[PDB]
Ligand binder design. Structure first.
Ligand SMILES: [Cl-]
Lengths: 87, 12
């Protein structure tokens, strides 16, 4: 029942929904943050080519460099998810 | 073509 809230996105609207969907399947399958992050990272490397990086958690800030149109930062329920492509 | 971005979580 995890509510998706997109906080900042430089990414087509299709991929934003795809990102939320893939994160949804990751939370359905895994409970530990690194495992959720690896699931999203690997599926995006496959569906959208390398190189993606994913961070999952409830308390963190970041500063990253990313190809344009390949950045999303959203909440799925209480969990925050940063997904982006650099390289 | 790259670009720099911040993120921060909600306060808890
Ligand atoms: Cl932010």
């Amino acid at each position: 029942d995890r509510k998706a809230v997109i906080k900042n996105a430089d990414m087509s609207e299709e991929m934003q929904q795809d990102s939320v969907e893939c994160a949804t399947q990751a939370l359905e399958k895994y409970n530990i943050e690194k495992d959720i992050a690896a699931h999203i990272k690997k599926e995006f490397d496959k569906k959208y080519n390398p190189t993606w990086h994913c961070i999952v958690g409830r308390n963190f800030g970041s500063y990253v460099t990313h190809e344009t149109k390949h950045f999303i930062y959203f909440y799925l329920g209480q969990v925050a998810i940063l997904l982006f492509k650099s390289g | 073509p790259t670009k720099d971005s911040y993120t921060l979580t909600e306060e808890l």
